[PDB]
Homo-oligomer: A and B are copies of this chain.
Amino acid sequence: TGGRNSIRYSELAPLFDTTRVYLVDNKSTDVASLNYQNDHSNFLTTVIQNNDY
């Protein structure tokens, strides 16, 4: 446990030990770019919830 438990993003921050990832259909950005011809029982989500990308 106490060894390597690192959860590293891009050039952001190491947040070591457990965090949250979100699978959301409602994401304002992606609704246009991807899922255009997809429903709610089959879709793609951006799990990088970073605004600047």
A interface residue numbers (CB < 8 A to B): 11-13, 51-52
Min Cβ gap A11→B in Å is 5
As for how many copies of this chain the complex holds, the number is 3
- Inter-chain contacts of A52 with B (CB < 8 A): 51-52
- Inter-chain contacts of A13 with B (CB < 8 A): 11-13
Min Cβ gap A19→B in Å is 13
Instruction: Find the B residue at minimum CB distance from A15.
Output: B11
Instruction: Find the B residue at minimum CB distance from A51.
Output: B52
- Inter-chain contacts of A51 with B (CB < 8 A): 52
Min Cβ gap A14→B in Å is 8
Min Cβ gap A16→B in Å is 13
